[PDB]
Structure 1
Amino acid sequence: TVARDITLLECVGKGRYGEVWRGSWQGENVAVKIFSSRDEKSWFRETELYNTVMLRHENILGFIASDMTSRHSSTQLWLITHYHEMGSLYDYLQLTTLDTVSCLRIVLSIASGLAHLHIEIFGTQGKPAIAHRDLKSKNILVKKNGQCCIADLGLAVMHSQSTNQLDVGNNPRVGTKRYMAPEVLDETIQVDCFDSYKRVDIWAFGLVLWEVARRMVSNGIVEDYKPPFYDVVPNDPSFEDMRKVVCVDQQRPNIPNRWFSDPTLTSLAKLMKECWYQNPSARLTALRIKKTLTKI
């Protein structure tokens, strides 16, 4: 097994979810995610997407292996992937500023990964449509070629159109609250429409776009890194804090005045806005976002 042969070198993240480690396998770095015994359903879900759907793309974090052992005494659950030494988009944006080329390359690579997840491809290379449900800057990793890939499919839901089957799962985990869409916060989300879940991803994508664009330099000016809604909610905000801001007050992240002196940041401001409509059916699709980014 890949797991018995791996040496854990350093913990690069710990949380409610479990732990992610840098490890060594056959002389190469790998990333190991060790799940809490209480998050067992996430491990299975992510595993079965990778091992049964054969989900593979430049902009989706690359699967190597998955291992589990269980006795009455204890259960260990490991997901092993490629290691990206630059870390998350969240870590990266704190240390670094961007130019037009490197900003476009980041947001274009996210949109490609998301569109690949959302689109149903039939038959031989087959794949159902997949919604992520926890998109955020921490779940995006930065590669050395300046592109990004999307990680963490523990909450993903699938839909096949050859069948009429929606696979939600029975997972007690739910999204990161800061990135939750209006319809999730006010509970008007159409829980039996698969498209509802894609539109929730598009909302979160818009917030990530905002995060990245802030760090693009324009006419000698740049903002510091902030997470969405930094000015109106505390760290680790509650469901209710987010509901007041997003539903009741209808707030969206502020667009700095300086962006409208730059053609690219101007084009990105318009996309962001079309991800954030209160009405989910009015939001753009992942494919359209990709096409619009391609046009610049």
Structure 2
Amino acid sequence: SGSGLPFLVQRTVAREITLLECVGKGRYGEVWRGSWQGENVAVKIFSSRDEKSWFRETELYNTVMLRHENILGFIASDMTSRHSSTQLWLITHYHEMGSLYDYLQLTTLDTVSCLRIVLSIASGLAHLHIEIFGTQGKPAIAHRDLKSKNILVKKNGQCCIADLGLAVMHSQSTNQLDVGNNPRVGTKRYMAPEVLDETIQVDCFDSYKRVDIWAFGLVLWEVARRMVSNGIVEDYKPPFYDVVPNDPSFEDMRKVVCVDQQRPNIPNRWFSDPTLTSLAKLMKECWYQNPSARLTALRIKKTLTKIDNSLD
């Protein structure tokens, strides 16, 4: 049932996996490359600081049909008791090119590759946001911690969205909102204005969708900077690099985004390129302070597909 293996089979696969090498370690826990029967899988071990995200992500992938080529493929989840301690495991497909964050730092893009990246992200986010009826379907889902580190680059040049630990869900069946309980907040650098100034409507599901659109505009910016046009390209930078420190505070960000009304600068060279011009316009329409004026994920998907079809 759900998105991955049957529940007893999930226990079996998890116990048989060997961890080969660690590819990420932090306050959150660890990500490892591992192997089941000579096939690479990704194994996340959650730290005790972020156990509630394991529960939320596991409950989601197992009670909902979430299969899409732009959402990280869930395989299994398990609880173990290694030695004088317990461990929470999430297993997914392994993507060897790694996060978009790492990928953007090591390579530049052409028009096709830039668009394949941003279009695949849009498809994944629209698929999350949109409800599917019937017993096959899914509730509407908002992510709440979208950023370049939570997007992986697959081998084919497309990406997938990862980390549903902060997800909220909605159905039109009840008009009911499932927020769960997780003290974790989004990455401060990607927090929308309504979150930073605590005006966000927390009983309205649309609010969370619009927070994702804010954060998606910022990722659009990160990617576009790396598309070459006329021999010119920018260095990789994170959103708001020039006005906040590494690991910025809540107050730092509120000052930048709400008080000073700052938004990512649009390089002027983008205006000589038709694709970058169009992406700059999209970005703007993700960055309105008024959450209700922002574009939807589906609209962004359709707009990127139109831009994709104008490529000669």
TM-score, normalised relative to structure 1: 0.98
CA RMSD of aligned residues (A): 1.1
Asked if 1:115 corresponds to 2:163, the answer is: no
CA offsets 1:211-231 (integer angstroms, 9 cap, x no match):
000000001100010000000
Runs of 4+ in 1 over 3 A off after TM superposition: 70-73
Contact 1:206 1:275 in 2 (8 A): yes
Once the two structures are superposed, residues 170-191 of structure 1 have per-residue CA deviations (whole angstroms, 9 ceiling, x without a partner) of 1011100000000000000001
Q: Which runs of 5+ in 2 are unaligned?
A: 1-11, 308-312
The residue aligned with 2:217 is 206
User: Given the superposition, is the C-alpha separation of residues 25 and 248 from structure 1 closer, same or farther in structure 2, using an over 3 Å criterion?
Assistant: same
Aligned equivalents of 2:49 and 2:214: distance in 1? 28
1:9-49 deviation per Cα after TM superposition (whole angstroms, max 9, x unaligned):
11111112111000111111110000113422110111111
CA contact (8 A) 1:179 1:204 kept: yes
> Does residue 68 of the first structure (1) align with residue 75 of the second (2)?
no
> Shift of residue 71 of structure 1?
9.5
Instruction: Output the CA distance in 1 between the equivalents of 2:240 and 2:95.
Output: 28
Give the secondary structure class of the aligned counterpart of 1:55. Answer: coil
Deviates further, 193-202 or 160-169: 160-169
| Unmatched runs of 5 consecutive residues or more in structure 1 | none
C-alpha distance in 1, partners of 2:23/2:83?
29
Deviation at 1:258, TM superposition (A): 0.3
SS at match of 1:40: helix
- Report how far residue 72 of structure 1 moved: 11
Whole-Å separation in 2 of the counterparts to 1:37 and 1:228? 29
Please tell me whether the aligned partners of residues 27 and 49 of structure 2 are also in contact (alpha carbons under 8 angstroms).
no
CA contact (8 A) 1:260 1:266 kept: yes
After TM superposition, give the deviation of residue 50 of structure 1 in Å: 0.9
Asked if the contact 1:182/1:247 (under 8 Å) is kept, the reply is yes
Pairs aligned (count): 296
Which region of structure 1 is more displaced relative to structure 2, 43-52 or 101-110?
A: 43-52
Q: Distance in 2 between matches of 1:193 and 1:230?
A: 31
Whether the 8 Å contact between 1:110 and 1:148 is mirrored in structure 2 is yes
CA distance in 1, matches of 2:180, 2:82: 24
Measured after TM superposition, the shift of residue 161 of structure 1 is: 0.9
Q: Deviations over 1:101-145 (max 9, x none)?
A: 000000000000000000000112120000000000000000110
1:4 positional shift: 1.4
Cα deviation, 1:187-242, whole Å, max 9, x if unaligned, reads 00001100000000000000000000000000110001000000000000000000
Identity of aligned residues (%): 100
